Nucleic acid binder design. Structure first.
Lengths: 113, 132, 37, 249, 135
RNA sequence: UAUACGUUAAGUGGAAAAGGAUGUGGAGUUGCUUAGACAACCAGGAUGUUGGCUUAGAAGCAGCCACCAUUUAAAGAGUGC
RNA sequence: UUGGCACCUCGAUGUCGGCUCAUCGCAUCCUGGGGCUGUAGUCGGUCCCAAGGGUUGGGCUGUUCGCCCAUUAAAGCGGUA
C-alpha cells in the first residue's frame, strides 16, 4: 500500500529528474530480444524499466497513451530504440517526452535521426 | 541444436552420428570440419550449435566451454560433489573466478564482471566448490 | 469409468462436479473419470 | 576342511561364471541402436549396423517391438548381467579373503605354541566357527643386544603391532604371501638387527626352511589396520633372506 | 507390536469407555497432533500400522511421540466352542481410548506434512479424529 | 388441511457405518480487492545451465545432493504432460 | 457354511443323495447395451446397466462336492423345512 506509494513517488522522482523519456509496448517479443535491448541500453547508459499503467499515471499527475502494456526508457536512446524497432517490428513506440515537453512519435523518430 | 563435443575428438560416432543422422548430412566431413576449427585442447568439451536449413545448408558455431568444465580444469578434479553442502570436496581461487569471468563475459547477459562472478559462484555452490 | 464411493480428484486437472444429484469427476484423462455408486 | 571347502566353493562359482557373460554385446548393441534410432522401422527382424575398425554387425530384433524398446531391452540385459557378475565377484572376494585367512591361520598353527593356540581357538569361536588377560608377546635375543618380540597368533600379533609400539617404529614381516609379524620395541637398530629380524621372519613363514624368502621391513606408521589380520603395508623396503636356526633366538 | 513385558493378571474385565479422557488431551511434547472424537479399543497392530505409515510419509521427519500403550489384554475363546468352562485365553493387547484424547504427536515437521501423515494414520484407525496443534 | 417463525426436497421422513463430495442454512475467523483483485482472453514465461553427482544416456523433470546468481516486471538450478 | 443360544415342535415337524415338478433373487455363465484399458486387429481383462430367455451328455463314487472324456454361446451362484 505504502509500498505502492513509495513506488509512484520514486517514479515521479526519476521522471522529473530526466529530460528525455520514451514510452513503448513490450508485447510479441521473447525475453532474449528483450535482454538484447536491455544490454545495448546498458552500454548506452540509457535506463529502461517496466511499470503498471495505474501507478504510472499517478506518478505523471504527481495521458491517453498510458493504457495497455507500457515500459519506459529514461535518458537523463531513441536511436537504439528505433533501431531495435526496425530490426524486430513487433512493438509500439507509442509516445515520448523531453524536458517535460510531450514528444510525438514522429518527434522521437526525428531525435532518432 | 546444441552439442557438447570435445574439440579434437570429432566423429566419436555413437553420440554424434545420431545427432545429425536425423538431419541426414555428412557426419564425418562435418566432424573433421569441426576438428579443423577446434584445433584446441582435445577434451575441451565445446558447446557447438548447429542450424540446418531444409535444403541441407548447415552452419555451426563453436562457443565457450561450460562453467563446470572450466572449474573442473581449474580444480584439476574429475567430478563435482555428489552431495554439495554436505560434502564440499573442491576448491579454486578468486583469481581463477576472475579469469573464467573475463573469459565468458561475451556470452552471458550480465554486463557486470562481478555479477557474472556471482553466477559462477552459484554454479560452484551447485557443484560443491568453495572459493579462496 | 471408475465407480467407487471414495471419489476424489487425482491430478490438478481433475474437476469434481455433481450431476443428477450424483458426484462425478471429470478430466481429459479418462482413467481419472469417476462416479459414486 | 573349511579352507578346502571355500576353495572348492570358488571353483564352483568360477566354472559357473563362464556361461553368463553376454554383457558387453548388449551394451554395444544398445549404443548402436540409440545411434541408429532413425533408420529403423518398428517391425523388423535385423539391422545391418556399423561399429564406430569399421565392421558391420547384424543385430537381431523383436519384430513386434520398436527399436527404442529393443535397445532398452539390451540395456536391461546388460544391467542384469552386470549385476549378477558383481554378485559373483563379491562372493569370490569373500571366499578368497576367507581362504587366505585360513591359510595364514594354518601357517600359524604349523609354527604355533600352545599359548597362542589357546588364543586362536577363542579367535575362531569369536568368528563363530566354534564354541567354547594381558599376556601378548614372546621374544628372544637379537642383534645389537636387542630384543625382538613376535606372536604366532594373529590377535597377539595385532596387539603388539598396535598397542606395543609407535608409528615411527619398524615392523618386519614377510615380503610374500603368508608369515608372522614381529618387531623390536621401536625397531630402529642397526643393519645387524635388520638382517636378524629377517631370519625370525623366514623361520615362522608359509614355507619354513625356505632359503629364498624375502622379508619386508616398513615403518609402523604405514601399517594398515584395515577379515582380521588383513594388514596391508606401505613405507616398505624388501630384502631377500632365508630361514635360520635357533640361534635366531 | 507393542507389549507390556510383565503383568499382574493376564485376564481382566473389559471395562466401560464412558466419559472423556483424564489427561493427554493436548499436545505438549510435539507441535502437531491428532486426537479422537469417539471411544474405542485400539490394538498394537493398529498403532504400529499408523506409526510406520506416518514415518514412511515423512522419511526422516522429526519426532512422533505416541501417547498411549496397550496395557490391557483381551481374551478370545477358541473356535466352535460352547459357552462356559472358564475364561478364554488371551489373544493380544489393547489400549483403551476416550474422546478428547491425543494419540499421536509430531514435531520437527511442517503443518501440511503433519496433517497428511495423521490423515493416513486415521484411515488405519477405526475412530473419528481431529487434527490439533499446540497452544 | 390451526397460528407464527425457519429448515429440508430426499419421498429424507418411512433402516445402517467407515469414508467421500463447490448440496444447502446459520454463526465465526482470515487473505486479496476499484492505487483496480478471482476467473477468462493477449503477451512473456529467459541466461550461467543440460545446476552438479549417479547414469550407457538423465539435458527442468529414473534417482542422490543442492536449488544459487543474472536479464530481471518475473520466470522454479523447475507444477504437470 | 462351520458354529453359539435353546425360543415352537419328543400325546412324533421323516433325516442325505437322486427322479418328476417347477418357482424366486441377482452378487449375471451366455446372449444384449456401454465406460476404462498396460484396448493395434481377432481374442481379452475390469467395471456399469440389465434376471427376457437359455444355461449339455457321459465315466468313477450312495454320494453332495470333486476329478476326468467329449461338446456347447454358455455348461452361473444361491433361497424355497
Amino acid at each position: 500500500i505504502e509500498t505502492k506509494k513509495v513506488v509512484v513517488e520514486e517514479i515521479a522522482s526519476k521522471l522529473k529528474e530526466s529530460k528525455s523519456t520514451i514510452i513503448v509496448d513490450y508485447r510479441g517479443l521473447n525475453v532474449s530480444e528483450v535482454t538484447e535491448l536491455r544490454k545495448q541500453l546498458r552500454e548506452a547508459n540509457v535506463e529502461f524499466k517496466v511499470y503498471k499503467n495505474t501507478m504510472t499515471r499517478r506518478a505523471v499527475e504527481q495521458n491517453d497513451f498510458l493504457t495497455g502494456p507500457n515500459a519506459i526508457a529514461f535518458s537523463t536512446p531513441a536511436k537504439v530504440l528505433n533501431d531495435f524497432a526496425k530490426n524486430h517490428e513487433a512493438l509500439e513506440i507509442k509516445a515520448g517526452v523531453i524536458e517535460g515537453k510531450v514528444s510525438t512519435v514522429e518527434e522521437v523518430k526525428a531525435l532518432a535521426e | 541444436v546444441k552439442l557438447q563435443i570435445p574439440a579434437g575428438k570429432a566423429n566419436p560416432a555413437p553420440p554424434v552420428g545420431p545427432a545429425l543422422g536425423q538431419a541426414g548430412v555428412n557426419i564425418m566431413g562435418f566432424c573433421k570440419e569441426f576438428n579443423a576449427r577446434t584445433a584446441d585442447q582435445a577434451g575441451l568439451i565445446i558447446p557447438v550449435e548447429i542450424s540446418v536449413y531444409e535444403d541441407r545448408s548447415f552452419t555451426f558455431i563453436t562457443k565457450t566451454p561450460p562453467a563446470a568444465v572450466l572449474l573442473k580444469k581449474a580444480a584439476g578434479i574429475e567430478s563435482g560433489s555428489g552431495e554439495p553442502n554436505r560434502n564440499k570436496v573442491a576448491t579454486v581461487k578468486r583469481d581463477k573466478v576472475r579469469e573464467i569471468a573475463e573469459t565468458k563475459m561475451p556470452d552471458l547477459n550480465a554486463a557486470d564482471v562481478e555479477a557474472a562472478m556471482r553466477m559462477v559462484e552459484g554454479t560452484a555452490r551447485s557443484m560443491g566448490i568453495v572459493i579462496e | 469409468m471408475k465407480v467407487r464411493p471414495s471419489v476424489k480428484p487425482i491430478c490438478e486437472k481433475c474437476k469434481v462436479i455433481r450431476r443428477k444429484g450424483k458426484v462425478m469427476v471429470i478430466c481429459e484423462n479418462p482413467k481419472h473419470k469417476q462416479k459414486q455408486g | 576342511n573349511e579352507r578346502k571347502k571355500n576353495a572348492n566353493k570358488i571353483k564352483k562359482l568360477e566354472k559357473t561364471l563362464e556361461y553368463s557373460e553376454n554383457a558387453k554385446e548388449f551394451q554395444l548393441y544398445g549404443e548402436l541402436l540409440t545411434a541408429n534410432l532413425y533408420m529403423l522401422k518398428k517391425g523388423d527382424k535385423q539391422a545391418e549396423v556399423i561399429n564406430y575398425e569399421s565392421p558391420t554387425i547384424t543385430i537381431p530384433l523383436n519384430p513386434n517391438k520398436t527399436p527404442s524398446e529393443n535397445a532398452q531391452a539390451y540395456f536391461t540385459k546388460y544391467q542384469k548381467a552386470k549385476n549378477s557378475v558383481a554378485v559373483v565377484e563379491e562372493q569370490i572376494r569373500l571366499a578368497q579373503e576367507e581362504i587366505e585367512y585360513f591359510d595364514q591361520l594354518i601357517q600359524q598353527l604349523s609354527s604355533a605354541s600352545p599359548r597362542d593356540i589357546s588364543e586362536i581357538r577363542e579367535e575362531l569361536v569369536e568368528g563363530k566357527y566354534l564354541r567354547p588377560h594381558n599376556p601378548v608377546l614372546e621374544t628372544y635375543e637379537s642383534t645389537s643386544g636387542l630384543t625382538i618380540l613376535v606372536g604366532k597368533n594373529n590377535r597377539q600379533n595385532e596387539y603388539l603391532t598396535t598397542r606395543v609400539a609407535a608409528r615411527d617404529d619398524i615392523w618386519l614381516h614377510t615380503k610374500d604371501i603368508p608369515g608372522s609379524h614381529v618387531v623390536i620395541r621401536s625397531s630402529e637398530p642397526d643393519e645387524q638387527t635388520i638382517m636378524e629380524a629377517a631370519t625370525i621372519a623366514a623361520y615362522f613363514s608359509k614355507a619354513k626352511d625356505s632359503s629364498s624368502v624375502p622379508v619386508d621391513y616398513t615403518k609402523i606408521r604405514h601399517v594398515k589396520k584395515p577379515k582380521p589380520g588383513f594388514v596391508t603395508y606401505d613405507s616398505q623396503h624388501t630384502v631377500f633372506v632365508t630361514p635360520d636356526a635357533d640361534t635366531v633366538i | 507390536m507393542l507389549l507390556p513385558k510383565r503383568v499382574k493378571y493376564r485376564r481382566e474385565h473389559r471395562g466401560k469407555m464412558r466419559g472423556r479422557a483424564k489427561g493427554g488431551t493436548e499436545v505438549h511434547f510435539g507441535e502437531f497432533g491428532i486426537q479422537a472424537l469417539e471411544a474405542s479399543w485400539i490394538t498394537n497392530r493398529q498403532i504400529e500400522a499408523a506409526r510406520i505409515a506416518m514415518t514412511r510419509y515423512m522419511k526422516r521427519g522429526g519426532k512422533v511421540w505416541i501417547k498411549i500403550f496397550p496395557s490391557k489384554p483381551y481374551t478370545a475363546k477358541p473356535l466352535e466352542v460352547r459357552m462356559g468352562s472358564g475364561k478364554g485365553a488371551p489373544e493380544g493387547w489393547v489400549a483403551v481410548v476416550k474422546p478428547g484424547k491425543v494419540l499421536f504427536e509430531i514435531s520437527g515437521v511442517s503443518e501440511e506434512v503433519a496433517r497428511e501423515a495423521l490423515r493416513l494414520a486415521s484411515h488405519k484407525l477405526p475412530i473419528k479424529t481431529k487434527f490439533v496443534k499446540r497452544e
